[PDB]
Amino acid sequence: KVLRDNIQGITKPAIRRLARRGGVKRISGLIYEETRGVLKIFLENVIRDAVTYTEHARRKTVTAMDVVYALKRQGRTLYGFGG
Amino acid sequence: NIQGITKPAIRRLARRGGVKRISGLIYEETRGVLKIFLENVIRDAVTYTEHARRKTVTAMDVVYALKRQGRTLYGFGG
Amino acid sequence: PHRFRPGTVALREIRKYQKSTELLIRKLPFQRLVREIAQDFKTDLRFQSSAVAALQEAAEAYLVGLFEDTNLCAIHAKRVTIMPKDIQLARRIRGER
Amino acid sequence: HRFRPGTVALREIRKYQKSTELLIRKLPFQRLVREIAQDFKTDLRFQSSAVAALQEAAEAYLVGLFEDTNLCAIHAKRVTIMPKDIQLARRIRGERA
Amino acid sequence: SVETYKIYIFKVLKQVHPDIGISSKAMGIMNSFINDIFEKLASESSKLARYNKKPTITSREIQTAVRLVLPGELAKHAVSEGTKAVTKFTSS
Amino acid sequence: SVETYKIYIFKVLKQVHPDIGISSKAMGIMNSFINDIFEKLASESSKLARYNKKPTITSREIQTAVRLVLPGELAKHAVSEGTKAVTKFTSS
Amino acid sequence: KSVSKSMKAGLQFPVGRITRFLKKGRYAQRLGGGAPVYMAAVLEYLAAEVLELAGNAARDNKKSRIIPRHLLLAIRNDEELGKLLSGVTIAHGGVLPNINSVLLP
Amino acid sequence: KSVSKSMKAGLQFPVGRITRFLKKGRYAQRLGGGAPVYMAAVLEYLAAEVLELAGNAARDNKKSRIIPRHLLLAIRNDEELGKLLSGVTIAHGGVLPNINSVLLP
DNA sequence: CGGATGTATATATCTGACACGTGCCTGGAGACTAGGGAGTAATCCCCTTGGCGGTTAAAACGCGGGGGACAGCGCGTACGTGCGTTTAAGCGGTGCTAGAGCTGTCTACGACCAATTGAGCGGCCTCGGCACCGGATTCTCAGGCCTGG
DNA sequence: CCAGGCCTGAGAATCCGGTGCCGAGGCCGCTCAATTGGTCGTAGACAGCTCTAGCACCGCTTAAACGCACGTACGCGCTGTCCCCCGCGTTTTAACCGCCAAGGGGATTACTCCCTAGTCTCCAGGCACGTGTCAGATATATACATCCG
C-alpha cells in the first residue's frame, strides 16, 4: 500500500514536547512546518545511507546496525543498539 | 606576543568576513579565540613531531593536525 | 475558576520532560513516515523494530539539540518565543543545508 | 571632504574579498606560534612552510567565525558585531561548552 | 622522487579546455584534492568490506563507497563513468 | 555467539563500587563505548604508522594515539596507567 | 602453568581478545607485544572512570543499579568526558536538566 | 604488446599506480580487478568537473591560466562541489564576495 | 549635480614562471600456477507484515485573554574617518651550527604452527530492587480584604 | 485612591509504606580461543656522516600602526498597540495491546569454477634537469562611476 502525507503524524503536541525537553518556553505557530521539513531532511539523509548499506549487503530489510553506521556517517553516533 | 595580532589586522579579517562595523572588545575576544585555536593545532602538531622523534615542526604535521580538527588544508602536501 | 498564569505550565512541562527519558513521538506515525521515505528510494523494503527505534531515538535527539540552539538564538534576539528564523540561523551556523 | 561612515567600510570589504593575500603580519604570527609552542615542548624549531600553513588555517578560521558573527548580529537587528555574537556562534558550532 | 598526478591532471585539463593553462600552486591543490578523495573512497570501502566479512574490495564496494561519499548527481555521474570504464576493461 | 565486554565491565564496577549493579541497557551502552574508543584508537595508530612509514604498532604508537584522541587529564592518567601496565608486563 | 596476559599486566580487560581484535582489524602488518597491554589498560581506565561517575549518580538518585540516565548524567556532568563524547547519543538517557535563567520568573 | 591498463579502459589516470596505492594501503586482503579501474574513472571524472568549472571561472576573469582563486570560486559556486568540500580551505583562495542587503545602503 | 577617491582600462616592459626536449631507471605489464573465495542452489524457521476491535489516552477544536513581539522615537556615546608621528616589519647579506636525512650492522622481536586446557558464553532459575499506587504531608501559586500610605 | 501585605484556599510535588513482578546476577556444562614452547626471518635500535636550512644578527627603507580630534550613526531604553499563543474544557479518533496467521527472506551448508596473489622477466612511461619565451604583474596615465558637500 502506497503511503502518502505521513508527515502529519508528527503532531503539534509532539513537536511541542520535544521543544519543552529542549528548554523552550514559548513556541510560535509557524514552527511546526519548519520542524517537519527539517525532520524530513534529516530522515532522508539517514535513510538514504541506511538503504545504501542494506542494498550493498544484498538484503531487503534495514537493520539497526545499518542505521548506526549511517549515523556515524553523519557523525551522530548512537549508543545502545549495537556496534 | 599576542599583541602582535593588531587591531587593523582583525579589522581586515572582519572585512574579508563581511563586517561593516566592529565593537571595541571584539579584538580581545578574537585574540582569545585565536589563542585557543592555535593551542589545539600546535598541540597536535607537536605530538606528531614527538612521535616522529624530531625537533622541527613540519607542514605535513600541521596539515595532519588540521585534518584532525575537521578542517583540511590544500596546498602544503596532501 | 482556577487559572494558571501563562508560563507556569510551560516551565512545569520543561521540568517534567527534561526529567523523563521516554520517547515523545508516537511510534506508529513515525514508522509510517520512515517507510514512506524509504519507499521513495527502494521499493519493497522491510524494516526491523530495532532499526525503527534507532531512527526514532536519533530523530528525537536531533530535534532536541536543534531546539536548544533555537532557544539560544531566540534569547540572543531578546525574545522568549522561538520563530522559524531562529531555526534557519541555527542550521546555517551548524552547517546544514 | 569626508566620507560618511560606511562607504570606506564597504570599499574595504570589496577590496579584501577580491584579494587572496594574508592579512596578518608574518613575524608577529611566527612569534605568537613560538610562544604558544614553548608551553608544550622546549627547544622546538619550525619550518617556514609550517608557519605559513598555520597562518592560512588561522586566517580561514577567523574569516568563517566573523561571517557567523555577522549573521548573529544581523539576527539581533544590529550592524555592529559584539563579543556576545562571537560567543553565540562558537556555542552553536560546538567550540564553547 | 615524489609521485604526483601532474601529468594526468594536465592531460585532463588539455582535454577539457585546450586553451587554458595551469599553475604550480593549482596543480598542488588538485593533487591534494585527488589524494584526499582517493583516501576517503578507499577507507569507506575498507570499512564496508569489514562489516560484511568480505576479504576483497571490488567494483561493487567502490560503487557503494562512491554513493556514500559523493552528493547525488555527482555520484550518479561517477557511477556511470565507473560502469562504462569497467565494461570497456572487461570487453578489452 | 556474540562477544561483549559484560564480564569485564562487571569486574571493574565491582572494584570501584562494590554495592552497585547495572542493567542490560547500561551494559549495552558501555560495550558500545568501549568498542568506539577501541576503534578510535586503533585507526589513529594505523594512520600514524602509515605517516611514519612504520609497519608495526607499538606501545609508543598507542601512547601518541591516546594523546591525540583524549583530552588533557584523561590522556595524562591513561598514559600513566598504560606505562604502568607495560612496565609490569615486561617485568613479569 | 598457564598465566593469562591480563594477570601479568595486573589488568582486568582481555589482553588476548584485544590482540585478536587488533590483528583481525588489519590496522598494521605487525603488532607489538605491549600494544594490546597498553590498549587494555587505557580501556579499563576509561571504563572505571565512567562507571565510578555513573555509580555516584545512581547513589545520588537513591538507587542501586546504573541505568542509561545515570550514564548520561555522568557524561554530561564531567567536562572531559563530555568533551570526549560531545557528538554521542545515549539511548534512553534524556537530557541534562537545564532551564535558561531568562525564562525563569 | 604492452597495452596499458589506462588505454584498455579509455582513461587518463594511472590504473597501475592506483592499484599499487590500494594494495600498499592494505585496505583489504585482496583487491578486485575492476576496483582500480573504477577508482581511476571516478577520480578522472571529478578532476575533469573541477577543472572545467575552474577554466570557466578563468575565462570569466579574462585569464588563460587557472589559479587557486579560480579553483575556490568554482568550488564555492558549484553546489555539489561545495557540499563535498565544505570544511576544506584552499591556500591563496580567498572567499566569495557577499555583502548582504542589510549592510548595503 | 561637482570632485576626489577608487576601480578598471590601454599600452609598454620585463620578467620570472610555465611549457617543452632529453636521459635514465624504477615500476608497470605479460605469463603461468594454485588455491581459496565468490556465486549458485536447497532448506529451515523466525521475524516481519497484515487484519480485528475496544478501551481509551491523546489529538483536535474552540475560546477568552494577557503577555509578548513589534514599530516608533529620542538620547548619548562609541566607533568610523582622516592626519601627523613613530615603530618595527620587510629585505637581504653574512655566519654558524643543530639537526633532518640516509646508510650499515646486528640483534632482539614478532610471525607462525601444533597441542592443551581453562575462561567465557548460552541456558536456567529464584529472589529482591524497582515500577506503581492511594493516603498524608508539605510546597509553590494566585486571587483577595482590610489596613497602611 | 493605590498598594502591600499576610491569608488562605488550593492544586501539585514529595514521602511513605504496601505488594508484586520480572530482570539482574549466580551457577553449570561445554567448546573454542588463548597460552606456551620452539624456530626463522627481518625491523628497528644504534652509531656515523654529511649538508640543507633554521636561527641569530645587523642595517636601511618605508609602509603599516598608534594616537588623537571630531562628528554622527546607531545601540538601546522606553512606550503604546494589537494579536496570537496559552491554558482549559469538550468531542473525536486512531494509537495501542493482544492474538493469530502467512510467507518470505536471512542464515546456513555444500559444491564448483575462476580470479587474484605470487614470482619472475623485459623495457618504456615518468621524473629530474636544463632552457626557451610569453601571459601577466607593474609603473604610470586616463576615461568612468559615484557619494558627499
Numbering used by the authors:
A (entry chain B): 20 to 102
B (entry chain F): 25 to 102
C (entry chain A): 38 to 134
D (entry chain E): 39 to 135
E (entry chain D), F (entry chain H): 58 to 149
G (entry chain G), H (entry chain C): 22 to 126
Paper text:
The histone H2A variant H2A.W occupies transposons and thus prevents access to them in Arabidopsis thaliana. H2A.W is deposited by the chromatin remodeler DDM1, which also promotes the accessibility of chromatin writers to heterochromatin by an unknown mechanism. We now report the cryo-electron microscopy (cryo-EM) structures of nucleosomes containing H2A and H2A.W, and the DDM1-H2A.W nucleosome complex.
A single-particle cryo-EM workflow was performed on the H2A- and H2A.W-nucleosomes, and both structures of nucleosomes containing H2A and H2A.W were determined at 2.9 Å resolution. By contrast, in the H2A.W nucleosome, the entry/exit regions are fully wrapped around the histone octamer, and 145 bps of DNA are visualized. By contrast, the entry/exit regions of nucleosomal DNA were tightly associated with histone in the H2A.W nucleosome, suggesting the low accessibility to DNA. The H2A Met109, His113, and Leu115 residues are substituted by Leu117, Asn121, and Val123 in H2A.W, respectively. Notably, we observed that the H2A.W Asn121 and Val123 residues contact the H3 Ile112 residue. In addition, the H2A.W Leu117 residue, which is not conserved in H2A, contacts the Asn98 residue of the same H2A.W, and may stabilize the docking domain of H2A.W. By contrast, H2A.W interacts with the H3 αN and α2 regions, resulting in the tight wrapping of the entry/exit DNA regions around histone octamer in the H2A.W nucleosome. In the absence of DDM1, both RsaI and MspI poorly digested the nucleosomal DNA, reflecting the tight wrapping of the entry/exit DNA region around histone octamer containing H2A.W. The pericentromeric heterochromatin is occupied with H2A.W, which forms a condensed structure caused by the extended C-terminal tail of H2A.W interacting with the linker DNA, and the H3 αN and α2 helices.
